[PDB]
């Protein structure tokens, strides 16, 4: 269904190669040289020998960073009447690029993707010329670079389903949406002017930028802005040129969460904690520019700029940007960290560690399919967080690029499936009132809650037996499986027939959907047919007690199906179920699913009104029991014992389990200040049997708990019209203006 997302694990690549003592750093062709000629004032030449290329663990997305160290060599800049020479000994240049995976197992290196991150040279022009020469060489030698990359044993991870990559929650908007924010806030600089002397030559740029736009080309924490040139003049000594209307600059910057006085209002919280505002990192150092220039179109109306004059003007723009970028005071994200929620049961949604990331998505240009255009709808800008003081020592910033493409919404909020398990499924488990929470093991890694202690499922009434149904450790499961909520009794054991140990199994899966009534969206947990019911005895018990076992099996299986005891004699059902028993491995086991359940319902001759009365009676029993739940979700030992010591048909117990599960899970969406837990569980149980949509929890009230602490530069709130368990719990919607 979904195309996979490929994680490039640069950190693990380096760790694993180091552990393995695997290195190809000195394997590179050492001799390098490049000339750039035809320039207006000068040409340039480099020549030398590499010492080593080193893949670093710095990469953000499918963008390997190569630290390339020069052993010896020179850079020469020369005109017809002068020249200068500079040693390149021990100089280190970090070159970045873009790759794409092949199902071959290999990586394809994008040919025009090279850019310079840093070089250790620490004048302006020498560093510029060196960058231009190194880039030209990398492009000429790209075949080698691809070989190097494909021999680096790059560690990748394929995610078949949506992933938060180790983060607990994530709020995202499309690049298009972010660009609307940027345009509205109008905090980008419009007018620009910059003068600069190269040699004895004067360069001046002067014009106005259009709205800066977040654009594609990079990933993770590396953000790119397209800065369209609305109008400009370029002057070189006495020559003044008129920029074509289609000129632009593309810059790359990083962002940082800066500590800030609290200004945002979080309705869901006390508004305490510490505010962080995501802004551009504007400090430059001696070896690292705050702003690098990764693209441009610098042309004049007469097309009479000298070859390479665009690159000369590029230096002037880059200088301007690094001297002015602090004026781009846009805030990209506002988060309150360590805030207390007004509702204690939603404290787990409050961020305790934060980051940001991005996923750029392109598509071929319909006009020139050799080139790519931005997909500004699918491209995702994200704020990610840990909650509950979960630590993340390996933060991944290259977020899944599939969320907004799947939701078809401009914004989304996502909760990790382990967080969904620990809060929605656990509430479901408490509601089922099987045992204390400490009798269960909650495993994020396997997405299952299982009993680590023996459980007494309760006395069974069928055929007046009144014996305990016992479940061994790991034989009760509540899990997320293939994006469904699944409840499973692997094996509940008791002697239904006196003297023969019977093993009863039950599996029911649910779909979590978002139901739309009158444009109010509300979550529902719906049964996904079919049920699976099983019964197993030893082959020896089967051969020596067959009639009694088949009669008992009819009772347990039809009973489980209809939700109460079934004691009616039935030749058809006896024969049918007998024929479903399979003898193998010294065991006789029956297992039915699908069409067989409806076949049984038909043969039972039970009517749909009778089925509804049963379910209503079991709902009544469910409300009474859950009515005894403690405010913190626990049920007293005295009350559990009452529930279990009263014999009930197995089908009663199992149907009640489901009614409670559905109500428990769904109530998680509906906490309010001062809510009473027994009351809301009863309300949801009753609403469900009565088909009362109006009383059920809405998605919007829960969403406000998610987004209260994580805000955008916009006076708006995410209104959800999409929700799906799909690798993560993905909520999608529109940002609607606050009135």
XYZ file of C-alpha atoms in Angstrom:
739
model
C 0.000 0.000 0.000
C 2.605 2.562 1.167
C 5.921 3.171 -0.572
C 8.691 2.566 1.959
C 10.673 5.304 3.654
C 14.434 4.850 3.737
C 16.396 5.952 6.780
C 20.027 6.748 6.191
C 21.721 5.925 9.442
C 25.004 7.810 9.138
C 25.679 7.546 12.861
C 25.441 3.737 12.795
C 27.440 3.588 9.548
C 30.439 5.211 11.240
C 30.035 3.188 14.459
C 29.776 -0.100 12.608
C 32.689 0.620 10.247
C 34.817 1.635 13.217
C 33.883 -1.503 15.149
C 34.738 -3.511 12.025
C 37.961 -1.611 11.387
C 36.608 -1.012 7.880
C 37.936 2.083 6.112
C 38.334 3.169 2.506
C 39.392 6.719 3.433
C 42.759 6.478 1.705
C 41.511 4.490 -1.287
C 40.659 7.583 -3.348
C 42.496 8.639 -6.546
C 44.956 11.075 -5.057
C 45.869 13.268 -8.031
C 43.412 16.094 -8.649
C 43.410 19.203 -10.802
C 40.890 21.666 -12.212
C 40.854 24.859 -14.252
C 38.179 27.521 -14.513
C 38.862 29.859 -17.448
C 37.011 32.527 -19.425
C 36.359 34.844 -16.483
C 36.052 38.607 -16.835
C 38.956 39.549 -14.550
C 40.732 36.271 -13.759
C 41.000 32.511 -14.233
C 41.744 29.989 -11.520
C 43.537 26.695 -11.215
C 44.017 24.131 -8.531
C 46.286 21.145 -8.461
C 47.270 18.749 -5.742
C 46.936 15.417 -4.000
C 44.189 14.202 -1.677
C 45.188 12.828 1.706
C 41.817 11.191 2.383
C 38.054 11.334 1.993
C 36.010 10.621 5.107
C 32.290 10.007 5.264
C 31.057 11.759 8.411
C 28.059 10.898 10.576
C 26.674 14.417 10.080
C 24.339 13.701 7.183
C 20.760 14.974 7.373
C 18.678 12.642 5.235
C 19.945 11.133 1.937
C 22.753 13.674 1.912
C 26.176 12.215 2.735
C 28.817 14.577 4.034
C 32.367 13.918 2.837
C 35.249 15.474 4.731
C 37.972 15.704 2.097
C 41.504 16.515 3.221
C 44.172 17.855 0.867
C 47.680 16.475 1.443
C 49.420 19.095 -0.684
C 48.664 21.337 -3.605
C 48.109 24.899 -4.715
C 45.340 27.247 -5.739
C 46.363 29.816 -8.346
C 44.355 32.861 -9.445
C 45.687 34.693 -12.492
C 44.885 37.417 -14.985
C 46.891 38.329 -18.051
C 49.062 40.629 -15.907
C 49.129 39.174 -12.382
C 48.821 35.945 -10.394
C 48.979 34.615 -6.865
C 49.639 31.137 -5.523
C 48.396 29.613 -2.256
C 49.271 26.266 -0.627
C 46.399 23.856 0.019
C 48.362 21.685 2.479
C 46.148 20.048 5.152
C 43.060 21.943 3.994
C 39.780 20.167 4.785
C 36.620 20.676 2.749
C 33.245 19.234 3.701
C 31.282 18.485 0.569
C 27.628 17.474 0.681
C 25.419 15.917 -2.005
C 22.198 14.006 -2.649
C 21.773 10.290 -3.197
C 18.853 8.012 -3.935
C 18.517 4.294 -3.218
C 18.216 1.541 -5.779
C 16.371 -1.736 -5.134
C 19.674 -2.985 -6.493
C 21.114 -2.211 -3.067
C 23.207 0.567 -4.569
C 22.953 4.349 -4.292
C 22.658 6.762 -7.216
C 24.541 9.990 -6.776
C 22.720 13.050 -8.077
C 25.166 14.761 -10.436
C 24.267 18.419 -9.871
C 23.761 18.067 -6.132
C 27.182 18.943 -4.721
C 27.605 21.850 -2.333
C 30.251 23.027 0.097
C 29.341 22.986 3.784
C 32.638 24.311 5.126
C 36.331 24.553 4.360
C 39.131 25.073 6.875
C 40.831 27.938 5.035
C 39.201 30.223 7.645
C 40.599 36.161 2.354
C 37.088 35.711 0.961
C 38.053 35.219 -2.665
C 40.541 32.360 -2.116
C 37.921 30.398 -0.208
C 35.331 31.174 -2.876
C 37.636 30.174 -5.750
C 38.611 26.948 -3.954
C 34.952 26.053 -3.444
C 34.190 26.643 -7.113
C 37.140 24.538 -8.251
C 36.401 21.674 -5.814
C 32.749 21.641 -6.891
C 33.650 21.583 -10.579
C 36.025 18.703 -9.917
C 33.443 16.711 -7.967
C 30.994 17.125 -10.853
C 33.626 16.001 -13.373
C 34.542 13.068 -11.147
C 31.057 12.114 -9.952
C 31.466 8.510 -11.151
C 34.260 8.079 -8.581
C 32.243 9.770 -5.847
C 29.380 7.341 -6.444
C 31.822 4.404 -6.192
C 33.162 5.778 -2.909
C 29.639 6.173 -1.562
C 28.676 2.667 -2.704
C 31.721 1.206 -0.957
C 31.045 2.953 2.360
C 28.711 0.212 3.632
C 26.059 2.806 4.318
C 23.571 1.536 6.885
C 19.966 2.017 5.876
C 16.641 1.157 7.445
C 13.485 0.517 5.478
C 10.287 1.579 7.182
C 7.309 -0.137 5.596
C 4.798 1.783 7.726
C 4.724 5.350 8.992
C 7.299 6.066 11.668
C 8.103 8.844 14.127
C 11.655 7.517 14.116
C 11.901 7.293 17.894
C 10.008 10.511 18.695
C 6.842 10.321 20.847
C 4.726 12.961 19.114
C 5.033 15.199 16.060
C 3.199 18.279 14.814
C 3.678 19.128 11.128
C 2.652 21.541 8.392
C 3.294 21.413 4.641
C 5.927 23.729 3.147
C 3.040 25.473 1.414
C 1.402 26.162 4.764
C 4.645 27.403 6.292
C 5.075 29.691 3.274
C 1.675 31.214 3.928
C 2.859 31.953 7.488
C 6.062 33.518 6.192
C 4.249 35.661 3.679
C 1.699 36.868 6.245
C 4.217 37.658 8.980
C 6.317 39.619 6.493
C 9.506 39.356 8.550
C 11.785 38.535 5.631
C 13.855 41.390 4.287
C 12.726 42.921 1.020
C 15.204 45.627 0.001
C 18.867 44.626 -0.291
C 22.063 46.577 -1.026
C 25.659 45.446 -0.863
C 28.962 46.854 -2.083
C 32.139 44.852 -2.340
C 35.604 45.156 -3.776
C 37.250 42.145 -5.438
C 40.845 43.008 -6.315
C 40.568 46.534 -7.676
C 37.089 45.727 -8.970
C 33.809 47.062 -7.598
C 30.638 45.005 -7.286
C 27.282 46.365 -6.187
C 23.922 44.653 -5.942
C 20.714 46.531 -5.327
C 17.108 45.428 -5.443
C 14.109 43.888 -3.708
C 13.283 40.316 -2.707
C 9.820 38.817 -3.080
C 8.449 36.741 -0.196
C 11.036 34.179 0.925
C 9.770 30.636 0.557
C 10.757 27.424 2.264
C 11.807 25.160 -0.573
C 13.084 21.652 -1.323
C 16.597 20.330 -1.999
C 17.739 19.407 1.511
C 16.281 17.547 4.503
C 16.219 17.273 8.274
C 17.455 20.346 10.120
C 18.929 21.827 6.921
C 16.312 24.345 5.746
C 16.331 26.028 2.327
C 14.721 29.353 1.395
C 13.962 30.482 -2.154
C 14.460 34.249 -2.262
C 12.958 35.517 -5.531
C 14.453 38.718 -6.863
C 11.502 40.998 -7.576
C 13.794 43.532 -9.230
C 17.484 44.398 -9.112
C 20.422 46.148 -10.687
C 23.899 44.606 -10.785
C 26.901 46.864 -11.245
C 30.469 45.853 -12.068
C 32.744 48.859 -12.063
C 31.044 51.072 -14.640
C 28.787 48.436 -16.158
C 25.294 48.461 -14.703
C 22.991 45.564 -15.535
C 19.257 45.110 -15.174
C 18.323 41.795 -13.596
C 15.803 39.686 -15.499
C 12.468 39.378 -13.632
C 13.074 35.652 -13.037
C 16.260 36.004 -10.936
C 16.539 34.350 -7.508
C 18.805 33.130 -4.708
C 18.422 29.903 -2.737
C 19.972 29.821 0.710
C 20.466 27.062 3.237
C 20.380 27.702 6.956
C 19.856 25.778 10.178
C 17.323 26.678 12.862
C 17.487 26.592 16.675
C 15.000 26.533 19.558
C 15.886 29.656 21.561
C 14.679 30.089 25.132
C 12.041 32.797 25.276
C 9.733 34.586 27.653
C 6.335 32.858 27.584
C 3.926 34.496 25.143
C 1.751 31.709 23.778
C -1.562 30.720 25.374
C -2.126 27.033 26.013
C -5.793 26.492 26.986
C -4.993 22.889 27.951
C -2.242 23.871 30.388
C -1.263 25.988 33.382
C 0.944 27.945 30.915
C 3.970 27.288 33.126
C 7.133 25.645 31.843
C 9.670 27.228 29.516
C 8.903 28.621 26.081
C 11.179 27.912 23.090
C 10.980 29.808 19.810
C 12.364 28.217 16.651
C 14.449 30.816 14.774
C 17.276 30.920 12.213
C 20.768 30.322 13.598
C 22.467 33.547 12.498
C 25.916 33.362 14.102
C 28.815 32.748 11.741
C 32.188 31.477 12.906
C 35.614 31.516 11.278
C 35.027 28.319 9.294
C 31.223 28.108 9.147
C 28.968 30.669 7.455
C 25.508 30.985 9.007
C 24.130 31.132 5.478
C 25.365 29.241 2.461
C 24.186 29.898 -1.069
C 23.046 26.699 -2.734
C 21.421 28.060 -5.877
C 20.896 31.154 -7.964
C 19.762 32.645 -11.217
C 21.638 35.882 -11.809
C 21.185 37.150 -15.339
C 20.690 40.480 -17.073
C 17.984 41.494 -19.544
C 20.576 41.850 -22.340
C 22.198 38.474 -21.545
C 25.517 40.302 -21.764
C 26.982 39.483 -18.368
C 30.439 37.966 -18.769
C 30.755 34.201 -18.346
C 31.072 33.655 -14.600
C 29.920 37.137 -13.569
C 26.895 35.440 -12.000
C 29.242 33.547 -9.678
C 31.080 36.788 -8.829
C 27.752 38.399 -7.920
C 26.949 35.262 -5.944
C 29.762 36.151 -3.534
C 28.206 39.576 -2.975
C 24.784 38.093 -2.242
C 26.310 35.527 0.125
C 28.099 38.311 1.985
C 24.887 40.341 2.217
C 22.970 37.350 3.560
C 25.509 36.606 6.273
C 25.525 40.269 7.355
C 21.736 40.589 7.340
C 20.207 37.200 8.046
C 19.614 38.241 11.673
C 16.886 40.538 10.315
C 14.803 37.495 9.298
C 13.077 37.367 12.666
C 10.495 34.762 11.686
C 9.577 32.253 14.396
C 8.869 28.842 12.858
C 7.535 27.057 15.942
C 6.531 27.931 19.499
C 6.666 25.240 22.180
C 6.092 25.302 25.941
C 8.453 22.752 27.483
C 7.819 21.040 30.841
C 4.324 22.519 31.073
C 1.726 21.107 33.453
C -1.616 20.153 31.868
C -4.859 21.248 33.565
C -6.038 17.641 33.229
C -3.595 15.239 34.948
C -4.629 12.374 32.674
C -3.306 14.314 29.669
C 0.063 15.211 31.224
C 1.607 12.646 28.912
C 0.969 14.913 25.892
C 3.120 17.735 27.244
C 6.525 17.912 25.608
C 9.666 17.396 27.712
C 12.308 17.362 24.917
C 11.928 18.954 21.512
C 13.482 19.220 18.065
C 12.543 20.023 14.499
C 13.087 18.420 11.132
C 11.946 18.405 7.564
C 11.189 16.172 4.623
C 11.562 17.611 1.140
C 9.573 16.009 -1.623
C 9.961 16.773 -5.297
C 8.421 15.557 -8.526
C 9.492 15.802 -12.155
C 8.865 19.088 -13.953
C 6.064 18.511 -16.533
C 7.818 21.046 -18.790
C 11.267 19.497 -18.370
C 11.110 15.978 -16.847
C 14.911 16.020 -16.529
C 14.477 18.514 -13.712
C 12.519 18.436 -10.463
C 9.924 20.809 -9.000
C 9.040 21.168 -5.333
C 6.012 19.290 -4.057
C 5.044 21.897 -1.500
C 2.008 19.915 -0.306
C 3.872 16.694 0.467
C 7.035 18.376 1.739
C 6.804 18.459 5.529
C 8.102 20.803 8.222
C 7.909 19.215 11.647
C 8.257 19.934 15.326
C 8.975 16.672 17.208
C 8.952 15.943 20.913
C 9.545 13.418 23.622
C 7.000 13.362 26.391
C 6.872 11.909 29.894
C 10.541 12.778 30.368
C 11.493 10.090 27.830
C 15.098 10.712 26.822
C 16.207 10.702 23.198
C 19.970 10.494 22.870
C 19.811 9.673 19.158
C 17.491 12.322 17.719
C 16.580 11.671 14.087
C 15.718 14.844 12.206
C 15.009 13.408 8.784
C 11.314 12.822 9.377
C 9.056 10.412 7.488
C 8.033 12.043 4.189
C 4.729 10.191 3.844
C 2.413 11.792 6.458
C 0.797 14.658 4.555
C 0.798 12.674 1.310
C -1.305 10.041 3.066
C -3.640 12.352 5.021
C -4.121 14.692 2.050
C -4.187 17.541 4.614
C -2.061 20.704 4.984
C -1.289 19.901 8.628
C -1.091 16.862 10.878
C -0.390 15.689 14.394
C 1.019 12.229 15.050
C 1.370 10.018 18.112
C 3.808 7.073 18.123
C 2.200 3.629 18.270
C 4.028 2.847 21.528
C 2.488 5.983 23.070
C -0.923 4.959 21.726
C -0.448 1.515 23.317
C 0.573 2.930 26.673
C -2.341 5.316 27.013
C -5.270 4.222 24.841
C -4.845 0.427 25.116
C -3.944 0.632 28.809
C -7.170 2.548 29.517
C -8.974 -0.204 27.601
C -7.273 -2.798 29.790
C -8.164 -1.058 33.057
C -11.776 -0.877 31.883
C -11.876 -4.603 31.166
C -11.282 -5.219 34.889
C -9.369 -8.480 34.465
C -6.637 -7.789 37.016
C -4.362 -5.125 38.500
C -2.105 -3.329 36.019
C 0.929 -4.861 37.728
C -0.156 -8.326 36.588
C 0.575 -7.223 33.028
C 3.688 -6.461 30.992
C 3.383 -3.514 28.628
C 5.821 -3.939 25.717
C 6.370 -0.962 23.370
C 8.725 -3.045 21.265
C 6.158 -5.728 20.483
C 3.107 -3.449 20.761
C 1.432 -5.856 23.137
C 0.144 -5.962 26.692
C 0.316 -9.486 28.085
C -0.260 -11.014 31.522
C 2.929 -11.944 33.355
C 0.961 -13.622 36.144
C -1.636 -16.378 36.059
C -5.124 -14.888 35.625
C -8.435 -16.252 36.898
C -10.748 -15.226 34.078
C -13.696 -16.197 36.274
C -16.214 -18.955 36.981
C -17.880 -20.430 33.900
C -21.626 -21.240 34.083
C -22.140 -23.255 30.867
C -23.647 -26.696 31.543
C -23.905 -25.676 35.221
C -20.214 -26.453 35.675
C -19.212 -23.347 37.667
C -15.451 -23.904 37.427
C -12.648 -21.324 37.050
C -11.328 -20.362 33.635
C -7.564 -20.030 34.104
C -5.094 -18.195 31.871
C -1.352 -18.869 32.119
C 1.220 -16.068 31.726
C 1.440 -14.713 28.157
C -1.905 -16.304 27.265
C -3.909 -13.091 27.371
C -2.991 -10.366 24.890
C -4.144 -6.840 24.085
C -2.155 -5.554 21.151
C -1.729 -3.431 18.068
C -1.480 -5.803 15.113
C -1.478 -4.691 11.490
C -2.844 -1.334 12.676
C -5.810 -2.906 14.462
C -6.536 -3.162 18.169
C -6.649 -6.879 18.913
C -7.857 -8.685 22.013
C -6.879 -12.334 22.310
C -7.379 -15.140 24.751
C -4.665 -17.497 23.510
C -5.763 -20.201 25.936
C -8.230 -20.092 28.815
C -8.165 -23.495 30.510
C -10.785 -25.473 32.511
C -12.661 -28.772 32.608
C -15.901 -28.096 30.780
C -16.340 -31.832 30.477
C -15.438 -33.356 33.834
C -11.992 -34.860 33.631
C -10.890 -33.374 30.319
C -8.806 -30.244 30.203
C -10.166 -27.925 27.546
C -8.259 -25.072 25.950
C -10.434 -22.194 24.794
C -9.243 -19.451 22.460
C -10.752 -16.187 21.263
C -9.467 -13.423 18.963
C -11.266 -10.212 18.039
C -9.738 -7.330 16.088
C -11.013 -3.736 15.983
C -10.584 -0.830 13.563
C -10.141 2.679 15.005
C -11.983 4.965 12.597
C -13.105 8.604 12.479
C -16.857 8.892 11.953
C -18.466 11.986 10.463
C -21.943 13.036 11.597
C -23.058 16.560 10.663
C -19.406 17.546 10.245
C -18.572 16.572 13.797
C -15.742 14.025 13.714
C -15.537 11.385 16.458
C -13.336 8.329 16.946
C -14.967 4.873 17.012
C -13.549 1.438 17.752
C -15.421 -0.906 15.414
C -15.343 -4.686 15.243
C -13.557 -6.036 12.220
C -15.110 -9.387 11.433
C -14.399 -12.085 11.659
C -13.985 -13.464 15.141
C -11.752 -16.471 15.723
C -12.881 -19.045 18.273
C -11.004 -22.213 19.110
C -11.310 -25.233 21.386
C -8.714 -27.926 21.903
C -8.400 -31.169 23.854
C -5.843 -34.002 23.779
C -6.349 -36.686 21.113
C -6.765 -39.246 23.884
C -9.495 -37.164 25.518
C -11.049 -36.758 22.072
C -11.144 -40.502 21.400
C -12.340 -41.537 24.850
C -14.894 -38.776 25.522
C -15.939 -37.649 22.059
C -19.715 -37.206 22.413
C -19.427 -35.186 25.617
C -16.657 -33.025 24.153
C -18.590 -32.233 20.986
C -21.736 -31.386 22.998
C -19.691 -29.162 25.290
C -17.978 -27.533 22.282
C -21.340 -26.666 20.733
C -22.196 -24.936 24.011
C -18.963 -22.944 24.328
C -18.671 -21.968 20.667
C -22.278 -21.012 19.880
C -22.388 -19.441 23.336
C -19.327 -17.314 22.661
C -20.851 -16.282 19.335
C -24.251 -15.222 20.693
C -22.979 -13.726 23.964
C -24.718 -15.989 26.463
C -25.241 -19.685 27.218
C -26.478 -21.980 24.461
C -27.852 -25.247 25.786
C -30.280 -26.180 23.008
C -29.753 -29.590 21.458
C -28.858 -29.271 17.784
C -28.087 -32.119 15.392
C -26.908 -29.708 12.701
C -24.502 -27.922 15.044
C -23.218 -31.156 16.557
C -22.437 -32.534 13.101
C -21.071 -29.224 11.802
C -18.721 -28.552 14.683
C -17.630 -32.178 14.959
C -16.493 -31.963 11.331
C -14.363 -28.928 12.131
C -12.178 -30.812 14.608
C -8.693 -31.610 13.348
C -6.564 -34.313 14.946
C -2.793 -33.792 14.696
C 0.191 -33.718 17.076
C -1.794 -35.680 19.701
C -4.355 -32.877 19.948
C -7.901 -32.444 18.700
C -8.585 -28.820 17.915
C -11.435 -26.870 16.424
C -10.937 -23.404 14.984
C -13.620 -21.433 13.191
C -13.666 -18.059 11.469
C -15.339 -16.169 8.658
C -18.383 -17.617 6.930
C -18.475 -20.424 9.488
C -19.555 -18.063 12.289
C -22.564 -16.922 10.259
C -23.299 -20.534 9.376
C -23.400 -21.239 13.113
C -25.593 -18.200 13.826
C -28.001 -19.447 11.180
C -28.090 -22.990 12.562
C -28.532 -21.711 16.129
C -31.826 -20.249 14.892
C -31.234 -17.181 17.054
C -32.732 -13.939 15.733
C -31.157 -10.494 15.519
C -33.633 -9.090 18.068
C -32.630 -11.896 20.477
C -28.982 -11.076 19.817
C -29.637 -7.423 20.631
C -31.398 -8.222 23.905
C -28.442 -10.342 24.951
C -26.009 -7.562 24.105
C -28.159 -5.002 25.938
C -28.248 -7.226 29.032
C -24.470 -7.647 28.905
C -24.036 -3.897 28.469
C -26.155 -3.423 31.611
C -23.872 -5.812 33.500
C -20.839 -3.971 32.067
C -22.004 -0.601 33.392
C -22.590 -2.057 36.837
C -19.089 -3.513 37.037
C -17.218 -0.564 35.556
C -19.376 1.496 37.917
C -17.132 0.107 40.656
C -13.849 1.238 39.117
C -11.612 3.475 41.244
C -10.785 6.966 40.019
C -7.198 5.950 39.161
C -8.326 3.063 36.946
C -7.774 0.235 39.415
C -10.487 -2.129 40.630
C -10.312 -3.400 44.208
C -9.423 -7.034 44.894
C -12.785 -7.407 46.630
C -14.649 -6.250 43.533
C -12.580 -8.321 41.065
C -13.287 -11.333 43.246
C -17.041 -10.645 43.108
C -16.886 -10.420 39.302
C -14.966 -13.678 39.030
C -16.679 -15.714 41.763
C -20.100 -15.229 40.189
C -20.446 -17.876 37.500
C -21.322 -16.535 34.048
C -21.598 -18.148 30.602
C -18.286 -17.935 28.753
C -20.012 -15.971 25.986
C -21.256 -13.487 28.559
C -17.761 -12.968 29.967
C -16.259 -12.581 26.513
C -18.888 -10.163 25.205
C -18.622 -8.077 28.384
C -14.847 -7.938 27.924
C -15.337 -6.390 24.467
C -17.908 -3.836 25.580
C -15.606 -2.660 28.356
C -12.554 -2.577 26.066
C -14.282 -0.388 23.503
C -15.537 1.980 26.179
C -12.207 2.099 27.979
C -10.188 2.910 24.875
C -12.645 5.515 23.654
C -12.900 7.279 27.039
C -9.205 8.220 26.616
C -10.383 10.837 24.093
C -12.771 12.358 26.576
C -11.188 13.322 29.901
C -12.269 16.690 31.323
C -11.361 18.692 34.419
C -12.808 16.828 37.389
C -14.205 13.911 35.364
C -15.386 10.812 37.268
C -13.969 7.633 35.714
C -16.859 5.216 36.503
C -19.372 7.720 35.126
C -17.678 8.345 31.767
C -17.098 4.613 31.183
C -20.795 3.965 31.865
C -21.761 6.881 29.605
C -19.723 5.545 26.686
C -20.935 1.955 27.193
C -24.517 3.255 27.213
C -23.997 5.609 24.279
C -22.640 2.726 22.220
C -25.571 0.367 22.768
C -28.037 3.240 22.374
C -26.262 4.507 19.241
C -26.024 7.954 20.832
C -23.410 9.796 18.750
C -23.931 13.142 20.508
C -22.672 11.869 23.890
C -19.466 10.212 22.571
C -16.056 11.934 22.847
C -15.027 14.093 19.886
C -11.649 14.116 18.199
C -11.405 17.869 18.456
C -11.357 18.022 22.253
C -8.478 15.527 22.333
C -6.623 17.358 19.560
C -6.661 20.521 21.656
C -4.652 18.604 24.273
C -2.090 17.726 21.598
C -1.631 21.113 20.014
C -2.001 23.420 23.019
C 1.736 23.290 23.823
C 3.018 23.196 20.217
C 2.047 26.179 18.140
C 2.694 27.812 14.789
C 3.174 31.452 13.687
C -0.508 31.707 12.886
C -3.636 32.569 14.829
C -5.284 29.216 14.209
C -6.072 25.704 15.426
C -5.716 22.319 13.738
C -9.229 21.031 13.012
C -9.133 17.290 12.374
C -10.960 15.613 9.486
C -8.635 12.616 9.120
C -7.476 10.008 11.604
C -5.829 6.645 11.027
C -3.760 4.060 12.810
C -1.123 3.600 10.182
C 2.284 2.875 11.683
C 1.630 5.876 13.908
C -1.643 7.437 15.083
C -1.931 10.096 12.392
C -4.362 12.999 12.812
C -4.735 15.286 9.793
C -6.669 18.499 9.232
C -6.820 22.174 8.389
C -5.597 25.155 10.341
C -8.749 27.169 10.994
C -8.559 30.790 12.118
C -9.463 31.466 15.726
C -12.459 33.873 15.720
